[model samples]
Target: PRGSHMAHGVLLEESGLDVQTIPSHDVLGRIVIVPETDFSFDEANETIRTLARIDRRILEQAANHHIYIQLLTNPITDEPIARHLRGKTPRGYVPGSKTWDEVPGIGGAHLVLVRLGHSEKGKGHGSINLELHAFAHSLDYIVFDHIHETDEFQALWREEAPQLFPREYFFLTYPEEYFAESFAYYYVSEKTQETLRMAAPRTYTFIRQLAERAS
Candidate 1:
């Protein structure tokens, strides 16, 4: 998120990355796409449309704020992502790290990145919707503050509702990620939705209230 929320937009624009702007239904701003060489325009359109359908409110907020939905053609550790996120030297290598397919998307204030070809195959890590997962992270950071509710979620789990959470290891790290993972799972499909409802009623209500409150 850099410093100011709008800083990423300016930084991305100055980077000279290939970009396309599409007017969203919200009428506040445009969904700016930085389509890398590998990702096609048609695919970008489909992605945008799908996002609009799945999370229309967040998409509207993104468009209104001129959020940059950047696409990555390479792995998450590649130079393009580094340039997009940090504007510094690429993270050349790490001893051990998750690959792009394992972590399909990342979101920050006014910015989000989705893997070019792997968005569909991003469900291996219990995240049914990678883009939504990322957006949920950003939303928690910027708007909803779901982590506060996550604290209660943790407390309830401590009270013997541990089965309420997904079995993914990431949920063990922090409440922020837990909220995002659950948020994505709740929105991806009816199957996951009902399952989450049956397993985690409080969490389902929390997410439902958030969705209902979103404009």
Candidate 2:
């Protein structure tokens, strides 16, 4: 009973990908950080350390919210995700066709798939944290249950939307994306963290509150 909260290697076994599960040290609950075995030791170490910093209770509040982190050796494409979904189109999946552009990351069904050693745009003085961005979306879905659509979030967006216009333009496309981009900047760089705090203080506060949650 000591570790009853931790037992999701079953999902890893089902996925058929060789993986290494690194459990979080905190006791807010268990999040099995499943990095595919192909990642270099350096890459795996870096990824695990970043995810370990997330507030443990945020992980605890999420039901079935195991943080399944997978590191792809190449730029992320829809093919593997599609395969993960067993050929069904992942909601919001572009092109609906087999071939599509490579994206920096993907999050859904409590899963985070990101390209190893790849960084997206909008990183100032530090590379974009692709896994963190993707994990943020997973948190958005599982932990907060789509917090972006709330009136409070929308009102904040309307207030500070313009200040965030010049960077990570994708963030402006949707509330969910804005949440993910903000989360990435909030964690990735001190420079961008200051930028987010200055440009969107309310949004910055919102993310900090979410991350600061404790049991």
Candidate 3:
């Protein structure tokens, strides 16, 4: 099992759930696959359960599967951070203070994922800033994969929050090297490009914060 196993089972199973997969190779030749899942509230919850199961299975299938999954959800117009938190902690477990210290990979990945999902008014901007600092401190290639487009997620981005929508803004901030080599290949379609463009400035600003924080 030298190769990575990406399971599209859940996305394929849910009817009416818009599923898009983007695959790319980094300069170091690491394959990054981004799967975006858009679904109603209930559908999104079900999808999370399915993805969680798939994540566990992948971990079981290979010891080296070290794949990262980023699940994106709409925060419903920024009224409550609860919705996004719910999407992140589906199992009724609160992330402990020592969570990052205990599992740096998962904790760091989760922080980055959640920061990207939060409202602009919240510490999301700060979270990204801190993440970039920490990322530079470690200097590792991190991959994040998660569910996107839940009702809650959409509410935060498309309506209530509005700022989190067009998510590519949060992603494109990685170094140009990270883009031309690591991320560019993931832009699979014109629609995807459009979405990225919409979010680019915000993402860029956030990343710049990260660089400043790191420096």
Best by lDDT: 2
Query: Please, what is the whole-model Cα lDDT of each candidate in the order they appear?
Result: 0.56, 0.60, 0.28
Candidate with better TM-score, 2 vs 3: 2
Candidate 3's error at 22, in angstroms?
Answer: 14
The clash count of every prediction, one per candidate, is: 0, 0, 23
TM-score-superior candidate, 1 or 2: 2
- Give the per-residue lDDT of model 1 (tens digit) for 106-202: 7756667776555553343356667777777777765654553555656644442356554555554456666776777687678888887887777
Full-model lDDT, candidate 2: 0.60
Pitting candidate 1 against candidate 3, the one with the higher TM-score is 1
Give the alpha carbon lDDT tens digit for every residue of 50-145 in model 3: 233212222222113333333334332221423344334333236542222122112223122222222112243322222222222122233212
Where does model 1 exceed 4 Å of error? 1-29, 32-38, 76-94, 97-103, 120-126, 146-161, 211-215
- lDDT (10s digit) by residue, model 2, range 1-215: 42322232223334333334444443212343443334465665566566655655554654345656655565445445444444344345454543323454677556676666654453211225776777787888767877877788888777876677555456675788788778878876679789899999999998889844322
RMSD of each: 7.2, 6.8, 15.6
Indicate the TM-score of model 1: 0.65
Q: Which stretches of model 3 miss by more than 4 angstroms?
A: 1-25, 28-33, 39-71, 74-106, 109-116, 119-125, 128-215
Better of 1 and 2 by lDDT: 2
